[PDB]
């Protein structure tokens, strides 16, 4: 089984400026690794697919990158609907299915 | 004429890898349907 | 619009069974595999079982392999989950995702439910 | 004539090689590459 690491558990920053974000996986999963934007009590939604493609309705300011086991989420501007838990998927080995921990970006 | 039934089995560090001091452990196991005293991580459910 | 609505959940007792629905809408939903997804309060979100676009491929997770039945009725557009031997740690909330075939059958889950409560307890 | 090919693959994308199947008033355009996105 490979697991997922998010190094970044706890994020705070003001509302305005740039947040990184990181993901690890124990094995080389090429780019196949998504990105999940989930506010407390409502349910997941896509924001990134292939670790460097944004989805469909998501702004300009999501963007991604890394490739093997290496990966980071950044965010330009954050917004009032930014402060957030994202979390990590990988899909290279279909059949397992693995989630990251988790990171909780939250007002400084 | 009358030789010893033993010999030594003697090892150094510097021999080739078909003389090098290999270890070996064997395993055995008479499995058949009967019951155990060896098992393996399975947790037990309920009756029904 | 699509809507994937969650009914079922409730209060159960240990080693008990209970049964879950998600009914789906507004997209041809007999094309598509669907998921079901958990996440325990204070955990992150657990993968549980998938089933193809017609149910002859079904998939497992290993800490709910044997005690879950996954199954769907393309007739009526909805998706089942039957729950059997409940112990303690099954308590979470079950989320419905549709799947998006990409590189391999489906890896994205890019429709989710409201989700349903499921909590066990004496 | 309202439709003319389709686009098979994976990834949609240039990343992984695809496919067009694109027929035309006179032949037809079959071929494997790695087109990037047209939105048209
Ligand atoms: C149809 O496609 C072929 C292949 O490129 C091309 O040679 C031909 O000119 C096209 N037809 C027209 C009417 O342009």
Not at chain 2, 15 to 36: C, D, I, T
Not at chain 3, 35 to 41: E, T
Request: charged share 15%; with cysteine.
């Amino acid at each position: 089984e490979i697991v997922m690491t998010q190094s970044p558990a706890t994020l705070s920053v003001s509302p305005g400026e740039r947040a990184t974000l990181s993901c690890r996986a124990s094995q080389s999963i090429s780019s196949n690794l998504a990105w999940y934007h989930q506010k407390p009590g409502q349910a997941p939604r896509l924001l990134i697919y292939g670790a460097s493609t944004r989805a469909t309705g998501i702004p300009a300011r999501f963007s991604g990158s890394g490739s093997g086991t290496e990966f980071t989420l950044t965010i330009s501007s954050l917004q009032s609907e930014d402060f957030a838990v994202y979390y990590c998927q990988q899909y290279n080995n279909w059949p397992p299915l693995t989630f990251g921990g988790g990171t909780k970006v939250e007002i400084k | 004429n009358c030789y010893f039934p033993l010999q030594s089995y003697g090892f150094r560090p510097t021999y080739g890898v078909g003389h090098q001091p290999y270890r070996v452990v064997v395993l055995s196991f008479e499995l058949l349907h009967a019951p155990a005293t060896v098992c393996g991580p399975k947790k037990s459910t309920n009756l029904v | 619009q699509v809507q994937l609505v969650e009914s079922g959940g409730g209060v159960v007792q240990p080693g008990r069974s209970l049964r879950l629905s998600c009914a789906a809408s507004g997209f041809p939903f007999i094309i598509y595999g669907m998921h079901w997804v958990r996440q325990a309060p204070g955990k992150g979100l657990e993968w549980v079982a998938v089933i193809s676009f017609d149910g002859r491929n079904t998939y497992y997770a290993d800490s709910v392999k044997g005690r879950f039945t996954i199954s769907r009725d393309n007739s009526k557009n909805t998706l089942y989950l039957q729950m059997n031997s409940l112990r303690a740690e099954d308590t979470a909330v079950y989320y419905c995702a549709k799947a998006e075939p990409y590189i391999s059958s489906f890896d994205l889950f890019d429709y989710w439910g409201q989700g349903t409560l499921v909590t066990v307890s004496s | 004539n309202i439709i003319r090919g389709w686009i098979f693959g994976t990834t949609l994308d240039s990343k992984t090689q695809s496919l067009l199947i694109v027929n035309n008033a006179t032949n037809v355009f079959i071929k494997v590459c790695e087109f990037q996105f047209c939105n048209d």
